[PDB]
RNA sequence: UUUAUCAUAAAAUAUAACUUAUAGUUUAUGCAUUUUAACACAGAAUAAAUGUUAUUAAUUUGAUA
RNA sequence: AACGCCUCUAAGGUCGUAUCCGUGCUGGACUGCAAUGAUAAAUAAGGGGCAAUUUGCAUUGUAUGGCUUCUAAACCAUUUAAAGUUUAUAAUUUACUUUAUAAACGACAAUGGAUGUGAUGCCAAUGUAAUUUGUAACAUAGUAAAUUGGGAGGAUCUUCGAUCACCUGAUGCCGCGCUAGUUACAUAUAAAAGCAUUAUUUAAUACAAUGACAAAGCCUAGAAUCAAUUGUAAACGACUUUU
């Protein structure tokens, strides 16, 4: 499941000519959040979580624009969250989806 | 053939599978003129017994079939019925010839009291 | 001590993987751990010998001294009566495949397997026999209580 | 469905000897086969743990030395432990016996769907058939534990998830035939109806 | 067993199997040739559970290993 | 051999009394009854089962030709 | 315990190594597996998916002599070659749990099978095959189906996995077509003279599967690489980056 809106620093994994390119993802797959989605789209995609899974990593960037290299194309990592109850760490990743996580 | 569209033709002892037992018979004619030498395809005299002639291909000339053999298949094809209508229905009498051969569970072609 | 069978003289057994297989024979004594002696008059075997891994065993003892001849042993099958009851076993009826189901002759067959399907198609509108639940009544029932009504009153379709 | 028999015939693993089973199938799979062995962490072993301890520990000490990643890589699952026999049984040096164990997919708890298809069992291979008393067996489960196989509590739990929503097919199937029961009442009167079935049976009536 | 495979003994059995070319006519009765048959007979038992041999017209190609061929009933002893 | 007849033996277990034992049983620690697979060669009687002799009934038996 | 007794052992439980096995760590079924994002050019026309596809041609795969079919509904929940399993029953109880009492089965014939283990088809014919055959009379039984919103429901390298089956709100009225039995009646079909017929066993019907064409609406409007740059990298490729 991802967020709806994306840095354009951090859709830049997602390419490897970013100049060239029209700029296309995540352009349709985040339509899901602004349908219906309520019996159809993501709350069944948060239901599978609390369910079948076992361990639920949380996906980020690194705004490493404000380093400031030569760069401009981000970092994307799979961080495991490791709180209990797993009803919990869907929550936790439903709260903190878009929103900046300092060290 | 009325029950079974099977005409009076003529099978060999080794493409066939004799069951158990009967039907029974005890005063049928069996109307002797059906010899085995009484029907030949006749025949193919090479060209229309005119000797040395002509020929266009693919003929039909071998096959009505006999009108006098549907007399002959409604006379046994009367006699036969009902005789087999008065069977005990058993296995094989009434409506009981009438289904395509393929066996089934628990059952043979090995070694059986066929 | 459960009284399993045991091998004694004379638990009346049938035999199988032998020469006398479908035999109800006696015992007589033990010879070995694997063998023992074996005399059923009645059933048509003379006093052999027999492999005990042949012959299973039955609920049917019957008494005889451990040294009896052939003679006593028939005086003593017939009088505690087996032949009645043994062919009322209760699952000497599940011997009979070996007298019905056993080649079962094709004269025998299709009488005896299309029978199988009058009897299916008069059972599966044997089902939805339902009262689980529905019960009442399971919209669209508004139709099909005048078909439910030809399982009730039934005079003469709903309702 | 369709085949030389069926496109499957499905073996449950569970109480049989490693090695009977393993000639059985590796004999059927050569006649044009197709198996599907599954419930491969039961299938049990002769002798007692530290007969089959040593021996595939052993088993694994036989590796390159010039390189050791060249050498007899040792699969721990199972099912491997089982589909290495079934390859010791089988020319796999030929392009016909690699067809032969192309047919087989050996399974260790049962999944994905051979849980509802029927799964028989092989009495020639059985171990409370073959193996006496006071011999000790083992299990294949405990072997690949103890030899390194990370995924034993995983598929204990898939067992128990598959074994918890079998008394909720059952449920719904031992009352049913208790429909089927009374619905056998109602056909006695049909027509003429069991008379035919029942004078080869009745031993069921 | 060897007395189940000693019923088959003389049964026309055939080996059935495919092939792109047609090459060929209807000529009796309709054909389309596009299936195979080698036609062959049994002659003995084979093992001592029977399996069976079978000398046949021309020979089995050997990737035929496996694949079924259809022993006839015909020609029958009852 | 086996079935069968004979005469005696001598009877090693099985039908065929009633002990005691055993627990479960009742009634007031015993009895009353119940299973004795505890079961007193505990007895009678029977099997003359077993033991002895002899003969055999479609004279019964296989293998070997 | 054997072996009236002792005994670390025969059955059973334990204590336990710098060893062994695994984690942690490095490589990754070279080119395994899962998740995911985008899905072209054009925007006139096209190209690309949806798609059973509806519309034909035409092929393969097949049940191949109408169906030598099968079903993709179960037989323990540590185990034990006597080992025990079911079944009611009474109590107990999430639970066929637990317990008691009583049964059946006597490791047979049988059960390794057809309980065809939600009870298979072997077909609606009321003449059934390499086509389908019609209509009344009588008896019982009495199905199968098609349109609308909320829930609970389902993931093991999948035969189609953001869908999904049941269930309630509720739309509605098939009242289209059920079937079994008894009896009557209405036709059509079917016969390849081969009378010691088989052959490179066709092939259908139907099922399913693409394939390609003119045929059929919908949906769709991105990238990678090279070249140039970088210097976290460098023998070369490759990797990290940038317009």
Same mark, same amino acid.
């Given at each position: ?24 993802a ?5 339509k ?24 639920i990593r ?6 490493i ?7 401009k194309?981000?970092?994307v ?14 929550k936790?990743?439903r ?9 | 053939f ?7 033709? +003529?099978?060999?002892?080794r ?6 037992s009967?039907?029974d018979?005890?005063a049928?004619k069996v109307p002797?003129?059906?010899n085995?030498?009484?029907?030949? +395809?006749?025949?193919?005299?090479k060209?229309?017994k005119?000797?040395?002639a002509?020929?266009?291909?693919a003929?039909?000339?071998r096959?009505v079939?006999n009108?006098? +053999? ?13 005789v ?6 058993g ?9 395509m ?7 043979y072609?090995?070694?059986? +009291?066929? | 001590?459960?009284?399993?069978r045991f ?22 004594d ?11 008059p009645?059933?048509?075997?003379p ?6 891994n ?7 003892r ?18 505690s009566?087996?032949?009645?009851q043994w ?11 070996i ?34 639940r ?21 005079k003469?379709?709903?309702? | 469905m ?14 049989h000897?490693?090695? /009977?089973?393993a ?6 799979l050569? &006649?044009?086969?197709?198996? #599907? ?6 299938l ?14 052993a088993?694994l000490?036989?590796? !390159? ?5 060249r ?7 199972p099912? /491997? ?7 010791? *049984?089988?020319?796999?040096?030929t392009? /016909?016996? &690699?067809?032969?164990? #192309?047919?087989?997919?050996?399974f ?14 092989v009495?020639?291979? *059985? ?10 067996? !083992?299990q294949?489960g ?9 995924? &034993?509590d ?5 067992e ?13 199937n ?15 009167? #049909? ?13 069921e009536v | ?8 003994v ?7 199997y ?24 049994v002659?003995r ?21 496996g ?12």
């Amino acid at each position: 499941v991802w967020a709806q809106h994306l840095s354009e620093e951090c859709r830049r994994r997602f390419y490897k000519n970013w100049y060239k390119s029209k700029k296309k993802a995540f352009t349709k797959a985040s339509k899901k959040w602004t349908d219906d989605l309520g019996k159809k789209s993501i709350e069944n995609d948060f239901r599978k979580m609390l369910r079948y899974c076992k361990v639920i990593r949380v996906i980020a960037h690194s705004q490493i624009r404000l380093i400031k290299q030569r760069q401009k194309k981000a970092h994307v990592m799979e961080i495991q969250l490791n709180g209990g109850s797993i009803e919990d760490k869907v929550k936790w990743a439903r709260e903190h989806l878009e929103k900046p996580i300092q060290v | 053939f009325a029950l079974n569209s099977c005409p009076l033709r +003529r099978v060999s002892q080794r493409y066939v599978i004799g069951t158990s037992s009967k039907v029974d018979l005890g005063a049928f004619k069996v109307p002797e003129h059906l010899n085995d030498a009484y029907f030949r +395809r006749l025949k193919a005299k090479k060209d229309k017994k005119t000797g040395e002639a002509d020929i266009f291909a693919a003929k039909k000339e071998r096959f009505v079939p006999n009108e006098q +053999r549907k007399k002959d298949q409604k006379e046994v094809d009367a006699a036969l019925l009902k005789v087999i209508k008065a069977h005990p229905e058993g296995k094989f009498f009434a409506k009981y010839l009438q289904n395509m051969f393929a066996l089934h569970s628990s059952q043979y072609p090995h070694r059986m +009291r066929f | 001590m459960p009284f399993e069978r045991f091998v004694q003289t004379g638990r009346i057994a049938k035999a199988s993987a032998g020469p006398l297989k479908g035999r109800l024979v006696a015992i007589v004594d033990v010879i070995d751990q694997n063998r023992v002696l074996v005399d059923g008059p009645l059933t048509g075997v003379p006093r052999q010998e027999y492999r005990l891994n042949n012959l299973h065993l039955t609920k049917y003892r019957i008494k005889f001294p451990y040294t009896a001849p052939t003679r006593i042993v028939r005086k003593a099958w017939t009088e505690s009566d087996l032949k009645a009851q043994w062919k009322v076993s209760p699952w000497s009826v599940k011997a009979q495949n070996i007298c019905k189901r056993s080649s079962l002759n094709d004269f025998d067959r299709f009488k005896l397997r299309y029978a199988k399907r009058q009897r299916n198609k008069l059972l599966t509108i044997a089902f939805n026999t339902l009262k689980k639940r529905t019960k009442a009544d399971g919209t669209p029932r508004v139709l099909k209580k005048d078909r439910r009504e030809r399982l009730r009153a039934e005079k003469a379709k709903g309702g | 469905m369709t085949g030389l028999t069926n496109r499957t015939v499905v073996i449950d693993g569970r109480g049989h000897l490693l090695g /009977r089973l393993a000639s059985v199938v590796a004999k059927y799979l050569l &006649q044009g086969g197709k198996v #599907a062995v599954v419930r491969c962490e039961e299938l049990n072993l002769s002798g007692h743990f530290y007969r089959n301890k040593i021996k595939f520990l052993a088993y694994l000490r036989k590796r !390159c030395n010039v390189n050791p990643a060249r050498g007899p890589f040792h699969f721990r699952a199972p099912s /491997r432990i089982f589909y290495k026999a079934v390859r010791g *049984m089988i020319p796999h040096k030929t392009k /016909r016996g &690699q067809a032969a164990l #192309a047919r087989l997919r050996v399974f260790d708890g049962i999944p994905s769907p051979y849980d509802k298809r029927r799964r028989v069992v092989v009495p020639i291979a *059985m171990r409370v058939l073959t193996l006496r008393s006071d011999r000790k067996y !083992c299990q294949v489960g405990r072997l690949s534990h103890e030899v390194g196989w990370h995924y &034993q509590d995983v598929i204990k739990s898939l067992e128990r998830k598959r074994k918890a929503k079998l008394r909720v097919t059952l449920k719904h199937n031992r009352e049913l035939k208790k429909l089927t029961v009374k619905a056998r009442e109602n056909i006695a009167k #049909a027509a003429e109806p069991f008379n035919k079935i029942i004078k080869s049976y009745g031993y069921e009536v | 067993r060897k007395e189940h495979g000693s019923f088959y003994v003389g049964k026309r059995c055939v080996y059935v199997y495919k092939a792109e070319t047609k090459k060929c006519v209807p000529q009796h009765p309709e054909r389309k040739t596009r299936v195979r048959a080698v036609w062959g007979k049994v002659t003995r038992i084979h093992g001592n559970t029977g399996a069976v041999r079978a000398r046949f017209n021309r020979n089995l190609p050997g990737h035929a290993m496996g694949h079924r061929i259809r022993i006839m009933l015909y020609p029958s002893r009852i």
